[PDB]
Amino acid sequence: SIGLAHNVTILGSGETTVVLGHGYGTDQSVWKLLVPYLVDDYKVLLYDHMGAGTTNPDYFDFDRYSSLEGYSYDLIAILEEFQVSKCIYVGHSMSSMAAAVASIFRPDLFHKLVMISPTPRLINTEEYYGGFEQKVMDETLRSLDENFKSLSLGTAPLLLACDLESAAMQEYCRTLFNMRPDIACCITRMICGLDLRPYLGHVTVPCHIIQSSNDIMVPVAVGEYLRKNLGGPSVVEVMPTEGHLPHLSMPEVTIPVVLRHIRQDITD
């Protein structure tokens, strides 16, 4: 089953289901400090996206996972298999955006989206600043495959805003380097090529946008851009954190913020 292939795990109990979707380089274990605050109040579904190192490489379709939509459609199938609807979806970056796209097709499946460090696109244009320049990205990606480890290790301390020797960095690298290298490079290229801007005005489910104050992958202005372009109601909360994975690296600040957006609706 698709749920088995995504290592679905169910916990808790409750009339409402929270779905936790890890982002790039991690797996559902990233949520281990949040879960205790949910288990008494909600049913919780956790899953691993296809290509995480905990998943079977034989199921990784390089054509489908070269664009984000494959992940969106896989998410719908997982929710359906577990008879989940009107869920509270909590995702980190690409997973939150995969859920946003999914919610256009299946708004019945989503009550709200809680989005940690989302961005609809990385590559700058004349009118949009994503943080990355096309011609630099082209150089980097040309030699990505043979440099995947050295580039990833070299950049991870700024990405995460924590020291190479820290517990958070040990944990991120454990899962990052668990991916098969060719799969990691496929997902990496997919992220780098994102342009989800055309979808945003059709997203109507409420969106709760949680950001670090300093994130090398998400210019702070992207949060406002999302509020102004999403088609439904949203809230933007910038936290006194640094790094792209503040749920991993700064849980003492981040968990309470995530909880509050899970627990408190902005509409009805």
Q: How far apart are CA 90 and CA 198, in angstroms?
A: 22
Cross-strand pairs, 20? 46, 90
Is residue 244 part of the annotated active site? The answer reads yes
Residue 229 marked in a binding site? yes
Q: 91's torsion region: left (phi>0), alpha (psi -120 to 50) or beta?
A: beta
Q: Give the C-alpha distances (Å, rounded to integers) separating 163 from 19, 82, 178, 180, 253.
A: 30, 39, 20, 25, 18
From 93, 117, 152, 249, active-site residue: 93
For the record, the structure tokens of 39 come out as 């288990």
From 6, 92, 111, 244, active-site residue: 244
Q: How far apart are CA 181 and CA 126, in angstroms?
A: 34
Class for domain 1-268, per CATH?
alpha beta
- Please enumerate in sequence order all residues whose Cβ is within 8 A of that of 24, keeping only pairs 6 or more positions apart, or say none: 92, 93, 94, 187, 188, 191
From 48, 95, 215, 247, active-site residue: 215
**Strand order across the 87-92 sheet:** 9-12, 43-47, 17-21, 87-92, 110-116, 207-214, 234-242
* Under 8 Å between Cβ of 116 and 92: yes
Sign of the C-alpha dihedral computed for residues 210, 122, 169 and 68 taken in this order: positive
Q: How far apart are CA 100 and CA 5, in angstroms?
A: 22
* Under 8 Å between Cβ of 89 and 99: yes
Q: How far apart are CA 4 and CA 113, in angstroms?
A: 24
What does the DSSP assignment read for 38-62?
Answer: TTTT-EEEEE--TTSTTS-GGG--T
Exposure b/e, 29-38, CB count within 10 A at least 16 = b: ebbeebbeeb
Angle at 120 between CA 20 and CA 30, to 5 degrees: 25
Nearest to residue 72, comparing CAs of 43, 45, 106, 44? 106
* Under 8 Å between Cβ of 44 and 10: yes
First to last CA, the chain: 36
Is residue 48 part of the annotated active site? The answer reads no
Strands 9-12 and 17-21: what pairing? unpaired
Q: How far apart are CA 248 and CA 219, in angstroms?
A: 19
* Under 8 Å between Cβ of 246 and 160: no
Solved using: X-ray
